[PDB]
Amino acid sequence: XXXXXXXXXXXXXXXXXXXXXXXXXXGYSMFAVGIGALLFGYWSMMKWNRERRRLQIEDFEARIALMPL
């Protein structure tokens, strides 16, 4: 009996298949989150600066109140 190297292909490994595809981001939907984070960013920040004004006037009031200084 002769024994040589046997042939096997099975699945053929798929000859040239695309793996690159669009994922997560679509296009217009990313701008809704992108610019949406900006509008949420300013509104949250400016409310803190209005709360800073409560401290600001109260800080300068200490100088006016102190005349024996």
Next chain:
Amino acid sequence: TYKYVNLREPSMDMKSVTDRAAQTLLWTELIRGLGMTLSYLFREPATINYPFEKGPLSP
């Protein structure tokens, strides 16, 4: 046999132009390229230290 490497204008009008502009305005594909090495970091490396481990051979 012919396979063609040229894409021949991927952008046409409105919807196809904006996403091709978005990747050049900010980055997106660079952040997508960052993710390629990110998962590559977690998977176990195939490394052999010679004074203890030995590499594959043949008869």
